[PDB]
Amino acid sequence: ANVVVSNPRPIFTESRSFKAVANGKIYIGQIDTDPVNPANQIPVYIENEDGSHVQITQPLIINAAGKIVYNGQLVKIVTVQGHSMAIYDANGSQVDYIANVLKYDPDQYSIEADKKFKYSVKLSDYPTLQDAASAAVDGLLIDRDYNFYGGETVDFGGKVLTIECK
Amino acid sequence: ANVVVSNPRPIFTESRSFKAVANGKIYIGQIDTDPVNPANQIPVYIENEDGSHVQITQPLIINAAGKIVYNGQLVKIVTVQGHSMAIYDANGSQVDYIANVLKYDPDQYSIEADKKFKYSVKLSDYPTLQDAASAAVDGLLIDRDYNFYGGETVDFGGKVLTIECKAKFIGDGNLIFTKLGKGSRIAGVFMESTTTPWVIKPWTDDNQWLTDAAAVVATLKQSKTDGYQPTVSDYVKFPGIETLLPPNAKGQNITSTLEIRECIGVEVHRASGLMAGFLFRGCHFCKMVDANNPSGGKDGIITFENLSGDWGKGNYVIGGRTSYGSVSSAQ
Amino acid sequence: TKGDLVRAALRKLGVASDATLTDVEPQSMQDAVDDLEAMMAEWYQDGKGIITGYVFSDDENPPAEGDDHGLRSSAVSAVFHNLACRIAPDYALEATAKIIATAKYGKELLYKQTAISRAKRAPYPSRMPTGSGNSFPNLNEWHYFP
Amino acid sequence: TKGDLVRAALRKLGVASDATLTDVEPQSMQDAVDDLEAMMAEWYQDGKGIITGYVFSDDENPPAEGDDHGLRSSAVSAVFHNLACRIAPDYALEATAKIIATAKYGKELLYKQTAISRAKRAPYPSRMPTGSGNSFPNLNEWHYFP
């Protein structure tokens, strides 16, 4: 859509020189508070595009490309809330502090799309009402005509359905 | 989890070199226009470390690392709208031109599904009803039972939400719904208690009456229908019934109650349940619309309690019917 | 942190730490680099000035920060004392005796090898004898080789 | 507090101890470390700059303090005392007389052994006769002196 990140691939550099942060640490924690404190600091998860979340240690390691790395590979790190990011270099000096990091990006989109959307099947996407009946898990929509004969039975499988006929 | 890590400070490099832009000027403007002209310029905001926003002029100074900087310190520069961005270096050469910054990564319907499909949340995908209620911005679907206890408060965030209950709410005490806006609907609701309370039947099989105390005690059973729980009024009505009844069948408070507390426009449609009650506390302009055969408990099926809050007005029973109850069905 | 100096950006923040600041982030975002480029035309007059390995930067597409320098690792220890004195008037101050001395001493070292090679006598005139102490005297005048 | 001179990270708090600070941690970051790296870059050329001997950073966790000492002995009394004088203007102060004297006299004894290796007088040219006081030289004249 219209949503895009500032850095197409996350990369962290020194404040007044364009050179990657080497052997840096990133502390991820609650918004508008220092993530240095363990109390504010939150656990970070690797978001697998499969639809799995696994838990890893709270600090993120910065390689020599200035990119996030965990388990010797480029990872996609997510949190369960809006977070603050604090970039620290190898001398432990604070390069940059970002109080607010929030994004809507649903990628994976197996787990996400169940919770953020409603489901109604349209009769136009099936050739028969029987197929659209078994494919209705919540909503059912009748947007076109259906022929029927004496003694034609349609089964919904015991599912509770809100049917809308237009 | 879904909040992907990012740095709000964009990386700047030259068009034909890897050298980072420095001592530049950045003009922010309207969608698909040149931001350089003052006519197309739009307010640039700084997102502070208190989460507040202060308005600044469109020119942004670029540090020697190719990142955004303003006030001489590292800050987050945000906008409240889509915008055009023109990146310039110190020599006045135009590094980039972005016609509309918020236009980027389009295609692949997963991202673009936000603007063209109805939102709803599902109770199975959130740990609790508290989480599912506050995460509901449109629909709320109850696809599993929710265990509740008295004093359980579910915050809906002050939003108009259509709660479509295709599953029960199990528990005893008050399941408290707060902050539901005007025009909110609760439809298909069912309320069932976890325990099965004792009930007495003071009628025959021809649906008359039993006026003998021992005969009412003889029909004593644990059920949620074909009788209602022993009332204090029943003790006066049938003399000596109380002594005959066991202690466990007396003093009962077993009702599964959905309480709408201090909301307006919340109308409970298709109210059903076994040992069910609906208590509207402090509410005004809230109706019970077409209740379909509920069975009452110690708490009334239709209860308007305006003892807390101001005097009730607009609290109506329009259509529907009720059955059983150990107290007044409409009170 | 700072790695290898592949940019005048790393030089600039170190120069600001020498002149005024006590090893903290500078307000500069292009200041010392402008003085560096102007000093490296007085030095390295197309290799006829002070040779530091410098190569010119266009400063069109180069922003004049990440700009070309090509300076030696040896030449780093000189320049940041010279540039420290150059941004000293900019703050309405004047550099101390340590900075100006090392600035000249660093400039001296960079030109040292150049001054050694260019300080050499020219060949013997074309009027030196062929020599009869050199066998088979023939040549009139001299070769002008040695 | 004054640290050991084994590595640049631990060296740094002892450099600042000389110049200004007394029992205070250095507010020097990586800015003063790179100045020491380039100090022994020019000096690590060993054709011009005075031979110190040094081991350069291979990146430990800090990229510029990943180094180790390669120092001779007179270089031990030279390099960090010189660095202390360079970081004294950072705090807008000038180093005391003991620090400047030690760094000089440390650099002075360091070039003492270096000078003998590099510089030696050239022998006789090749206009040189063998000499007739020679007894069986087995040559008449010489290619140079030998």
PDB file of N, CA and C in Angstrom, chain B residues 69-151:
ATOM      1  N   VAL B  69      18.433  15.392  11.138  1.00  0.00           N
ATOM      2  CA  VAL B  69      18.866  16.015  12.359  1.00  0.00           C
ATOM      3  C   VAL B  69      18.187  17.357  12.354  1.00  0.00           C
ATOM      4  N   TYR B  70      17.719  17.824  13.533  1.00  0.00           N
ATOM      5  CA  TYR B  70      17.172  19.149  13.644  1.00  0.00           C
ATOM      6  C   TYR B  70      17.316  19.510  15.095  1.00  0.00           C
ATOM      7  N   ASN B  71      17.377  20.833  15.381  1.00  0.00           N
ATOM      8  CA  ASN B  71      17.680  21.421  16.674  1.00  0.00           C
ATOM      9  C   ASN B  71      19.108  21.155  17.106  1.00  0.00           C
ATOM     10  N   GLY B  72      19.969  20.677  16.172  1.00  0.00           N
ATOM     11  CA  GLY B  72      21.351  20.342  16.425  1.00  0.00           C
ATOM     12  C   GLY B  72      21.530  19.006  17.099  1.00  0.00           C
ATOM     13  N   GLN B  73      20.432  18.243  17.320  1.00  0.00           N
ATOM     14  CA  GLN B  73      20.482  16.962  17.987  1.00  0.00           C
ATOM     15  C   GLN B  73      19.656  16.011  17.175  1.00  0.00           C
ATOM     16  N   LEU B  74      19.768  14.693  17.455  1.00  0.00           N
ATOM     17  CA  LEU B  74      19.102  13.675  16.676  1.00  0.00           C
ATOM     18  C   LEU B  74      17.676  13.549  17.125  1.00  0.00           C
ATOM     19  N   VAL B  75      16.740  13.789  16.179  1.00  0.00           N
ATOM     20  CA  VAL B  75      15.323  13.830  16.438  1.00  0.00           C
ATOM     21  C   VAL B  75      14.671  13.048  15.336  1.00  0.00           C
ATOM     22  N   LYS B  76      13.375  12.723  15.538  1.00  0.00           N
ATOM     23  CA  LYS B  76      12.568  11.981  14.607  1.00  0.00           C
ATOM     24  C   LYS B  76      11.706  13.008  13.935  1.00  0.00           C
ATOM     25  N   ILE B  77      11.730  13.053  12.585  1.00  0.00           N
ATOM     26  CA  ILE B  77      10.957  13.979  11.792  1.00  0.00           C
ATOM     27  C   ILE B  77       9.855  13.166  11.176  1.00  0.00           C
ATOM     28  N   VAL B  78       8.593  13.573  11.439  1.00  0.00           N
ATOM     29  CA  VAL B  78       7.411  12.852  11.042  1.00  0.00           C
ATOM     30  C   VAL B  78       6.514  13.832  10.345  1.00  0.00           C
ATOM     31  N   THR B  79       5.512  13.300   9.620  1.00  0.00           N
ATOM     32  CA  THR B  79       4.495  14.077   8.956  1.00  0.00           C
ATOM     33  C   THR B  79       3.209  13.413   9.357  1.00  0.00           C
ATOM     34  N   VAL B  80       2.076  14.101   9.097  1.00  0.00           N
ATOM     35  CA  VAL B  80       0.756  13.658   9.478  1.00  0.00           C
ATOM     36  C   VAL B  80      -0.021  13.328   8.229  1.00  0.00           C
ATOM     37  N   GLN B  81       0.667  13.292   7.066  1.00  0.00           N
ATOM     38  CA  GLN B  81       0.030  13.099   5.794  1.00  0.00           C
ATOM     39  C   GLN B  81       1.077  12.591   4.850  1.00  0.00           C
ATOM     40  N   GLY B  82       0.627  12.127   3.653  1.00  0.00           N
ATOM     41  CA  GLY B  82       1.484  11.792   2.538  1.00  0.00           C
ATOM     42  C   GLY B  82       2.116  13.054   2.030  1.00  0.00           C
ATOM     43  N   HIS B  83       3.304  12.950   1.405  1.00  0.00           N
ATOM     44  CA  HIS B  83       4.055  14.141   1.118  1.00  0.00           C
ATOM     45  C   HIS B  83       5.030  13.845   0.031  1.00  0.00           C
ATOM     46  N   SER B  84       5.587  14.916  -0.580  1.00  0.00           N
ATOM     47  CA  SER B  84       6.644  14.819  -1.556  1.00  0.00           C
ATOM     48  C   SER B  84       7.895  15.273  -0.862  1.00  0.00           C
ATOM     49  N   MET B  85       9.049  14.672  -1.222  1.00  0.00           N
ATOM     50  CA  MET B  85      10.306  14.958  -0.581  1.00  0.00           C
ATOM     51  C   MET B  85      11.320  15.202  -1.658  1.00  0.00           C
ATOM     52  N   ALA B  86      12.093  16.309  -1.543  1.00  0.00           N
ATOM     53  CA  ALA B  86      13.158  16.623  -2.465  1.00  0.00           C
ATOM     54  C   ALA B  86      14.413  16.754  -1.653  1.00  0.00           C
ATOM     55  N   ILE B  87      15.378  15.843  -1.908  1.00  0.00           N
ATOM     56  CA  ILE B  87      16.623  15.719  -1.190  1.00  0.00           C
ATOM     57  C   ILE B  87      17.659  16.484  -1.966  1.00  0.00           C
ATOM     58  N   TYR B  88      18.354  17.426  -1.290  1.00  0.00           N
ATOM     59  CA  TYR B  88      19.374  18.265  -1.871  1.00  0.00           C
ATOM     60  C   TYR B  88      20.578  18.127  -0.991  1.00  0.00           C
ATOM     61  N   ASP B  89      21.790  18.277  -1.586  1.00  0.00           N
ATOM     62  CA  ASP B  89      23.051  18.258  -0.876  1.00  0.00           C
ATOM     63  C   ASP B  89      23.486  19.688  -0.644  1.00  0.00           C
ATOM     64  N   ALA B  90      24.780  19.889  -0.292  1.00  0.00           N
ATOM     65  CA  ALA B  90      25.344  21.178   0.036  1.00  0.00           C
ATOM     66  C   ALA B  90      25.650  22.012  -1.181  1.00  0.00           C
ATOM     67  N   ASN B  91      25.696  21.383  -2.377  1.00  0.00           N
ATOM     68  CA  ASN B  91      26.074  22.040  -3.609  1.00  0.00           C
ATOM     69  C   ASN B  91      24.844  22.402  -4.397  1.00  0.00           C
ATOM     70  N   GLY B  92      23.641  22.100  -3.851  1.00  0.00           N
ATOM     71  CA  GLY B  92      22.373  22.458  -4.440  1.00  0.00           C
ATOM     72  C   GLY B  92      21.936  21.492  -5.504  1.00  0.00           C
ATOM     73  N   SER B  93      22.717  20.405  -5.729  1.00  0.00           N
ATOM     74  CA  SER B  93      22.388  19.333  -6.643  1.00  0.00           C
ATOM     75  C   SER B  93      21.263  18.535  -6.044  1.00  0.00           C
ATOM     76  N   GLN B  94      20.346  18.019  -6.895  1.00  0.00           N
ATOM     77  CA  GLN B  94      19.200  17.276  -6.437  1.00  0.00           C
ATOM     78  C   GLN B  94      19.569  15.824  -6.473  1.00  0.00           C
ATOM     79  N   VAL B  95      19.672  15.224  -5.264  1.00  0.00           N
ATOM     80  CA  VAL B  95      20.051  13.851  -5.051  1.00  0.00           C
ATOM     81  C   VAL B  95      18.922  12.940  -5.469  1.00  0.00           C
ATOM     82  N   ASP B  96      17.702  13.176  -4.927  1.00  0.00           N
ATOM     83  CA  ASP B  96      16.548  12.365  -5.229  1.00  0.00           C
ATOM     84  C   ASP B  96      15.389  13.297  -5.411  1.00  0.00           C
ATOM     85  N   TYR B  97      14.304  12.764  -6.009  1.00  0.00           N
ATOM     86  CA  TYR B  97      13.026  13.414  -6.062  1.00  0.00           C
ATOM     87  C   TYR B  97      12.075  12.273  -5.856  1.00  0.00           C
ATOM     88  N   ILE B  98      11.157  12.443  -4.881  1.00  0.00           N
ATOM     89  CA  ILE B  98      10.157  11.472  -4.534  1.00  0.00           C
ATOM     90  C   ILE B  98       8.866  12.215  -4.719  1.00  0.00           C
ATOM     91  N   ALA B  99       8.033  11.783  -5.695  1.00  0.00           N
ATOM     92  CA  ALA B  99       6.763  12.406  -5.993  1.00  0.00           C
ATOM     93  C   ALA B  99       5.773  12.221  -4.873  1.00  0.00           C
ATOM     94  N   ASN B 100       5.688  10.997  -4.308  1.00  0.00           N
ATOM     95  CA  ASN B 100       4.866  10.751  -3.153  1.00  0.00           C
ATOM     96  C   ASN B 100       5.584   9.674  -2.394  1.00  0.00           C
ATOM     97  N   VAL B 101       6.067  10.026  -1.179  1.00  0.00           N
ATOM     98  CA  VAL B 101       6.826   9.192  -0.276  1.00  0.00           C
ATOM     99  C   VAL B 101       5.974   8.074   0.257  1.00  0.00           C
ATOM    100  N   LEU B 102       4.717   8.395   0.647  1.00  0.00           N
ATOM    101  CA  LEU B 102       3.743   7.412   1.045  1.00  0.00           C
ATOM    102  C   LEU B 102       2.998   6.976  -0.184  1.00  0.00           C
ATOM    103  N   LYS B 103       3.563   5.966  -0.876  1.00  0.00           N
ATOM    104  CA  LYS B 103       3.005   5.379  -2.066  1.00  0.00           C
ATOM    105  C   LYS B 103       3.721   4.064  -2.248  1.00  0.00           C
ATOM    106  N   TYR B 104       4.754   3.815  -1.409  1.00  0.00           N
ATOM    107  CA  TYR B 104       5.844   2.930  -1.723  1.00  0.00           C
ATOM    108  C   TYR B 104       5.590   1.636  -1.005  1.00  0.00           C
ATOM    109  N   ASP B 105       6.343   0.596  -1.434  1.00  0.00           N
ATOM    110  CA  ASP B 105       5.910  -0.760  -1.708  1.00  0.00           C
ATOM    111  C   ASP B 105       4.416  -0.994  -1.906  1.00  0.00           C
ATOM    112  N   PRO B 106       3.853  -0.756  -3.091  1.00  0.00           N
ATOM    113  CA  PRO B 106       2.464  -1.067  -3.375  1.00  0.00           C
ATOM    114  C   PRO B 106       2.500  -2.420  -4.034  1.00  0.00           C
ATOM    115  N   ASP B 107       1.313  -2.996  -4.349  1.00  0.00           N
ATOM    116  CA  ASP B 107       1.141  -4.327  -4.891  1.00  0.00           C
ATOM    117  C   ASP B 107       1.393  -5.391  -3.855  1.00  0.00           C
ATOM    118  N   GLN B 108       0.750  -6.564  -4.074  1.00  0.00           N
ATOM    119  CA  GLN B 108       0.661  -7.699  -3.184  1.00  0.00           C
ATOM    120  C   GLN B 108      -0.379  -7.393  -2.156  1.00  0.00           C
ATOM    121  N   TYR B 109      -1.578  -7.985  -2.373  1.00  0.00           N
ATOM    122  CA  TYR B 109      -2.857  -7.605  -1.812  1.00  0.00           C
ATOM    123  C   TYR B 109      -2.947  -7.665  -0.308  1.00  0.00           C
ATOM    124  N   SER B 110      -1.967  -8.319   0.365  1.00  0.00           N
ATOM    125  CA  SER B 110      -1.870  -8.459   1.801  1.00  0.00           C
ATOM    126  C   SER B 110      -1.766  -7.144   2.533  1.00  0.00           C
ATOM    127  N   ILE B 111      -1.009  -6.191   1.945  1.00  0.00           N
ATOM    128  CA  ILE B 111      -0.755  -4.877   2.486  1.00  0.00           C
ATOM    129  C   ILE B 111      -1.946  -3.988   2.215  1.00  0.00           C
ATOM    130  N   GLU B 112      -2.554  -4.170   1.019  1.00  0.00           N
ATOM    131  CA  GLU B 112      -3.578  -3.318   0.468  1.00  0.00           C
ATOM    132  C   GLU B 112      -4.957  -3.776   0.872  1.00  0.00           C
ATOM    133  N   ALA B 113      -5.041  -4.817   1.734  1.00  0.00           N
ATOM    134  CA  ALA B 113      -6.269  -5.419   2.198  1.00  0.00           C
ATOM    135  C   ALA B 113      -6.935  -4.569   3.248  1.00  0.00           C
ATOM    136  N   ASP B 114      -6.163  -3.638   3.851  1.00  0.00           N
ATOM    137  CA  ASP B 114      -6.576  -2.729   4.896  1.00  0.00           C
ATOM    138  C   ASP B 114      -7.664  -1.791   4.438  1.00  0.00           C
ATOM    139  N   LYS B 115      -7.605  -1.372   3.154  1.00  0.00           N
ATOM    140  CA  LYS B 115      -8.443  -0.330   2.619  1.00  0.00           C
ATOM    141  C   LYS B 115      -9.632  -0.863   1.863  1.00  0.00           C
ATOM    142  N   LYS B 116      -9.918  -2.190   1.915  1.00  0.00           N
ATOM    143  CA  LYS B 116     -10.906  -2.745   1.017  1.00  0.00           C
ATOM    144  C   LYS B 116     -11.527  -4.002   1.563  1.00  0.00           C
ATOM    145  N   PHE B 117     -11.320  -4.325   2.864  1.00  0.00           N
ATOM    146  CA  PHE B 117     -11.982  -5.455   3.482  1.00  0.00           C
ATOM    147  C   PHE B 117     -12.321  -5.053   4.886  1.00  0.00           C
ATOM    148  N   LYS B 118     -13.523  -5.490   5.347  1.00  0.00           N
ATOM    149  CA  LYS B 118     -14.089  -5.216   6.650  1.00  0.00           C
ATOM    150  C   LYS B 118     -13.237  -5.809   7.739  1.00  0.00           C
ATOM    151  N   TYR B 119     -13.057  -5.052   8.846  1.00  0.00           N
ATOM    152  CA  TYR B 119     -12.300  -5.475   9.996  1.00  0.00           C
ATOM    153  C   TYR B 119     -13.231  -6.179  10.940  1.00  0.00           C
ATOM    154  N   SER B 120     -12.692  -7.200  11.633  1.00  0.00           N
ATOM    155  CA  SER B 120     -13.341  -7.825  12.750  1.00  0.00           C
ATOM    156  C   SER B 120     -12.214  -8.501  13.465  1.00  0.00           C
ATOM    157  N   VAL B 121     -12.440  -8.842  14.749  1.00  0.00           N
ATOM    158  CA  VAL B 121     -11.495  -9.524  15.591  1.00  0.00           C
ATOM    159  C   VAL B 121     -12.224 -10.745  16.044  1.00  0.00           C
ATOM    160  N   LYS B 122     -11.464 -11.745  16.530  1.00  0.00           N
ATOM    161  CA  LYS B 122     -11.997 -13.023  16.905  1.00  0.00           C
ATOM    162  C   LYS B 122     -11.388 -13.315  18.229  1.00  0.00           C
ATOM    163  N   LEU B 123     -12.210 -13.881  19.138  1.00  0.00           N
ATOM    164  CA  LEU B 123     -11.878 -14.093  20.523  1.00  0.00           C
ATOM    165  C   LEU B 123     -10.826 -15.164  20.678  1.00  0.00           C
ATOM    166  N   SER B 124     -10.750 -16.116  19.718  1.00  0.00           N
ATOM    167  CA  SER B 124      -9.805 -17.211  19.728  1.00  0.00           C
ATOM    168  C   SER B 124      -8.380 -16.769  19.468  1.00  0.00           C
ATOM    169  N   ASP B 125      -8.194 -15.611  18.786  1.00  0.00           N
ATOM    170  CA  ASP B 125      -6.894 -15.098  18.416  1.00  0.00           C
ATOM    171  C   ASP B 125      -6.347 -14.155  19.459  1.00  0.00           C
ATOM    172  N   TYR B 126      -7.130 -13.834  20.518  1.00  0.00           N
ATOM    173  CA  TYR B 126      -6.682 -12.984  21.602  1.00  0.00           C
ATOM    174  C   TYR B 126      -6.796 -13.779  22.882  1.00  0.00           C
ATOM    175  N   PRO B 127      -5.944 -13.591  23.899  1.00  0.00           N
ATOM    176  CA  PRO B 127      -5.971 -14.400  25.111  1.00  0.00           C
ATOM    177  C   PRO B 127      -7.218 -14.236  25.944  1.00  0.00           C
ATOM    178  N   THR B 128      -7.815 -13.021  25.965  1.00  0.00           N
ATOM    179  CA  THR B 128      -8.929 -12.702  26.826  1.00  0.00           C
ATOM    180  C   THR B 128      -9.869 -11.836  26.038  1.00  0.00           C
ATOM    181  N   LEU B 129     -11.083 -11.620  26.603  1.00  0.00           N
ATOM    182  CA  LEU B 129     -12.114 -10.765  26.066  1.00  0.00           C
ATOM    183  C   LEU B 129     -11.741  -9.314  26.236  1.00  0.00           C
ATOM    184  N   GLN B 130     -10.882  -8.996  27.240  1.00  0.00           N
ATOM    185  CA  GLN B 130     -10.342  -7.675  27.488  1.00  0.00           C
ATOM    186  C   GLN B 130      -9.446  -7.249  26.351  1.00  0.00           C
ATOM    187  N   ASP B 131      -8.655  -8.206  25.813  1.00  0.00           N
ATOM    188  CA  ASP B 131      -7.721  -7.969  24.740  1.00  0.00           C
ATOM    189  C   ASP B 131      -8.449  -7.854  23.427  1.00  0.00           C
ATOM    190  N   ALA B 132      -9.482  -8.703  23.205  1.00  0.00           N
ATOM    191  CA  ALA B 132     -10.256  -8.721  21.984  1.00  0.00           C
ATOM    192  C   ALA B 132     -11.163  -7.521  21.854  1.00  0.00           C
ATOM    193  N   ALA B 133     -11.610  -6.943  22.991  1.00  0.00           N
ATOM    194  CA  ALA B 133     -12.513  -5.817  23.026  1.00  0.00           C
ATOM    195  C   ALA B 133     -11.800  -4.544  22.678  1.00  0.00           C
ATOM    196  N   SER B 134     -10.587  -4.344  23.247  1.00  0.00           N
ATOM    197  CA  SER B 134      -9.792  -3.161  23.010  1.00  0.00           C
ATOM    198  C   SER B 134      -9.133  -3.200  21.652  1.00  0.00           C
ATOM    199  N   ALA B 135      -9.019  -4.405  21.036  1.00  0.00           N
ATOM    200  CA  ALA B 135      -8.431  -4.565  19.726  1.00  0.00           C
ATOM    201  C   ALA B 135      -9.484  -4.532  18.651  1.00  0.00           C
ATOM    202  N   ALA B 136     -10.771  -4.343  19.029  1.00  0.00           N
ATOM    203  CA  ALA B 136     -11.868  -4.310  18.094  1.00  0.00           C
ATOM    204  C   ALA B 136     -12.019  -2.873  17.707  1.00  0.00           C
ATOM    205  N   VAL B 137     -11.983  -2.595  16.385  1.00  0.00           N
ATOM    206  CA  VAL B 137     -12.154  -1.267  15.846  1.00  0.00           C
ATOM    207  C   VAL B 137     -13.363  -1.240  14.952  1.00  0.00           C
ATOM    208  N   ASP B 138     -14.048  -2.394  14.784  1.00  0.00           N
ATOM    209  CA  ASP B 138     -15.168  -2.488  13.890  1.00  0.00           C
ATOM    210  C   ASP B 138     -16.038  -3.580  14.456  1.00  0.00           C
ATOM    211  N   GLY B 139     -15.777  -4.854  14.083  1.00  0.00           N
ATOM    212  CA  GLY B 139     -16.567  -5.973  14.531  1.00  0.00           C
ATOM    213  C   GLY B 139     -15.868  -6.635  15.674  1.00  0.00           C
ATOM    214  N   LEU B 140     -16.642  -7.405  16.467  1.00  0.00           N
ATOM    215  CA  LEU B 140     -16.164  -8.238  17.539  1.00  0.00           C
ATOM    216  C   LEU B 140     -16.934  -9.512  17.388  1.00  0.00           C
ATOM    217  N   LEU B 141     -16.215 -10.646  17.238  1.00  0.00           N
ATOM    218  CA  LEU B 141     -16.803 -11.937  17.002  1.00  0.00           C
ATOM    219  C   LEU B 141     -16.374 -12.774  18.166  1.00  0.00           C
ATOM    220  N   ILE B 142     -17.366 -13.463  18.771  1.00  0.00           N
ATOM    221  CA  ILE B 142     -17.208 -14.328  19.905  1.00  0.00           C
ATOM    222  C   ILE B 142     -17.431 -15.689  19.316  1.00  0.00           C
ATOM    223  N   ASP B 143     -16.333 -16.463  19.177  1.00  0.00           N
ATOM    224  CA  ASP B 143     -16.339 -17.760  18.544  1.00  0.00           C
ATOM    225  C   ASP B 143     -15.950 -18.828  19.532  1.00  0.00           C
ATOM    226  N   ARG B 144     -15.869 -18.468  20.833  1.00  0.00           N
ATOM    227  CA  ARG B 144     -15.553 -19.405  21.877  1.00  0.00           C
ATOM    228  C   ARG B 144     -16.128 -18.826  23.130  1.00  0.00           C
ATOM    229  N   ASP B 145     -16.275 -19.671  24.176  1.00  0.00           N
ATOM    230  CA  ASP B 145     -16.804 -19.261  25.455  1.00  0.00           C
ATOM    231  C   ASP B 145     -15.730 -18.522  26.207  1.00  0.00           C
ATOM    232  N   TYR B 146     -16.146 -17.601  27.104  1.00  0.00           N
ATOM    233  CA  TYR B 146     -15.246 -16.783  27.876  1.00  0.00           C
ATOM    234  C   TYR B 146     -15.646 -17.018  29.298  1.00  0.00           C
ATOM    235  N   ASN B 147     -14.665 -17.464  30.116  1.00  0.00           N
ATOM    236  CA  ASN B 147     -14.818 -17.699  31.529  1.00  0.00           C
ATOM    237  C   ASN B 147     -14.633 -16.377  32.214  1.00  0.00           C
ATOM    238  N   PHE B 148     -15.635 -15.973  33.027  1.00  0.00           N
ATOM    239  CA  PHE B 148     -15.614 -14.717  33.728  1.00  0.00           C
ATOM    240  C   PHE B 148     -16.006 -14.974  35.152  1.00  0.00           C
ATOM    241  N   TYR B 149     -15.677 -13.991  36.011  1.00  0.00           N
ATOM    242  CA  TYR B 149     -15.951 -14.000  37.421  1.00  0.00           C
ATOM    243  C   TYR B 149     -16.482 -12.622  37.701  1.00  0.00           C
ATOM    244  N   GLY B 150     -17.098 -12.416  38.889  1.00  0.00           N
ATOM    245  CA  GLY B 150     -17.656 -11.139  39.277  1.00  0.00           C
ATOM    246  C   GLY B 150     -16.593 -10.090  39.420  1.00  0.00           C
ATOM    247  N   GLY B 151     -16.874  -8.863  38.923  1.00  0.00           N
ATOM    248  CA  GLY B 151     -15.929  -7.773  38.961  1.00  0.00           C
ATOM    249  C   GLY B 151     -14.972  -7.786  37.799  1.00  0.00           C
TER     250      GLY B 151
END
